[PDB]
Amino acid sequence: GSFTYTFVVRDENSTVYAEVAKILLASGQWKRLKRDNPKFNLMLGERNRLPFGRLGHEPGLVQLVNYYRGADKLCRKASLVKLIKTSPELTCTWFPESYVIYPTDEREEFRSSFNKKKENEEGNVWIAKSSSGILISSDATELLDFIDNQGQVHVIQKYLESPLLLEPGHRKFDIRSWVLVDNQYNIYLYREGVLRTSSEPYNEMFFEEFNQYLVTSLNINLENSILCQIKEIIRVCLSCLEPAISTKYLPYHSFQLFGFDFMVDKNLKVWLIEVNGAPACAQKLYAELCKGIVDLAISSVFPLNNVFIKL
Ligand SMILES: Nc1ncnc2c1ncn2[C@@H]1O[C@H](COP(=O)(O)OP(=O)(O)NP(=O)(O)O)[C@@H](O)[C@H]1O
Numbered sequence: 542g543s544f545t546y547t548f549v550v551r552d553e554n555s556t557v558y559a560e561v562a563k564i565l566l567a568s569g570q571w572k573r574l575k576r577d578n579p580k581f582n583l584m585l586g587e588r589n590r591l592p593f594g595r596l597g598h599e600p601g602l603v604q605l606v607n608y609y610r611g612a613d614k615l616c617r618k619a620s621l622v623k624l625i626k627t628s629p630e631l632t633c634t635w636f637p638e639s640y641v642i643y644p645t646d647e648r649e650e651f652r653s654s655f656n657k658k659k660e661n662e663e664g665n666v667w668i669a670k671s672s673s674g675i676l677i678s679s680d681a682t683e684l685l686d687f688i689d690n691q692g693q694v695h696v697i698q699k700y701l702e703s704p705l706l707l708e709p710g711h712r713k714f715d716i717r718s719w720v721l722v723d724n725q726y727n728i729y730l731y732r733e734g735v736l737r738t739s740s741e742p743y744n745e746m747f748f749e750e751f752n753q754y755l756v757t758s759l760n761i762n763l764e765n766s767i768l769c770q771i772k773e774i775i776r777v778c779l780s781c782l783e784p785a786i787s788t789k790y791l792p793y794h795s796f797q798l799f800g801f802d803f804m805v806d807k808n809l810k811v812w813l814i815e816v817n818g819a820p821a822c823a824q825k826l827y828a829e830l831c832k833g834i835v836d837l838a839i840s841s842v843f844p845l846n847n848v849f850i851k852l
């Protein structure tokens with residue numbers, strides 16, 4: 542329809558959306574405006590503290606923003622924990638046992654869990670992390686100190702003592718998928734992940750080789766084990782969040798890119814450890830990705846004249 546849409550960029554430092562800001566121009570149908578110009582169709586907003594209250598007011602403007610208000614209820618450690626312990630649906634065998642500790646909480650239920658394991662004489666190594674410096678120990682009282690020492694509401698999570706290692710180099714790793722949730726709440730998983738292998742033994746590795754280390758050194762395949770369970774976790778996590786961030790009755794549209802962080806243990810079991818709301822990408826994939834975003838979440842709303850899986 543030879544029409545030209547408009548957009549503002551409120552986050553100059555996002556490499557994922559500094560990229561998108563381009564691919565748009567590439568279609569010859571988009572024009573970037575002044576960061577403060579309110580006549581935009583699409584707003585590539587800021588990582589945190591985004592002005593959602595001013596969306597869908599400008600007369601006649603249908604607006605889309607690249608963040609779901611309230612999506613931090615899944616992205617912040619402490620929140621993610623409450624969310625899984627709240628909704629009855631969350632059968633969460635894939636989520637490390639976790640407790641929120643306020644410096645000044647669940648440190649009482651934590652101690653109970655800790656002591657129970659101590660008497661049953663089983664793995665009792667935990668890791669204390671900050672919701673937004675990490676400690677890994679077996680001493681509760683000590684872990685709790687660390688928390689109180691530096692006020693910042695930490696989370697005490699059960700540490701995976703039996704992690705699937707790699708080689709050469711026998712190093713620990715973690716996988717990270719990219720999930721795109723559009724304005725109608727369709728979920729799309731980019732066919733490519735990325736691993737963050739460790740330097741010292743127990744570099745960034747892609748699904749290219751890793752799909753091999755699962756066969757040329759193991760039994761099953763990349764799909765028949767990991768990629769299978771990963772989909773289930775994504776689906777339930779976002780399904781439990783929908784009610785609290787659905788834009789069905791809001792005066793504007795919303796879409797968002799999430800970066801899920803997983804881990805695999807000895808028995809090839811996949812655990813969820815974190816979900817990042819403003820994930821960057823590999824310098825390599827930054828292209829086939831940012832184009833799926835425009836295709837699936839932007840152009841789907843503002844029409845112009847495989848790679849993704851729909852969970
Ligand atoms: N439950 C767990 N069991 C085993 N290892 C874990 C667990 N949780 C986290 N880790 C490891 O701890 C590392 C850092 O934890 P993470 O929760 O990602 O912290 P962060 O605050 O986002 N910081 P960053 O190190 O920049 O990613 C991860 O890359 C994992 O290798």
Ligand SMILES: [Mg+2]
Binds near residue numbers: 609611788
């Ligand atoms: Mg929103």
Ligand SMILES: [Mg+2]
Binds near residue numbers: 607608796797798799
């Ligand atoms: Mg996004």
Ligand SMILES: [Mg+2]
Binds near residue numbers: 815
């Ligand atoms: Mg992290």
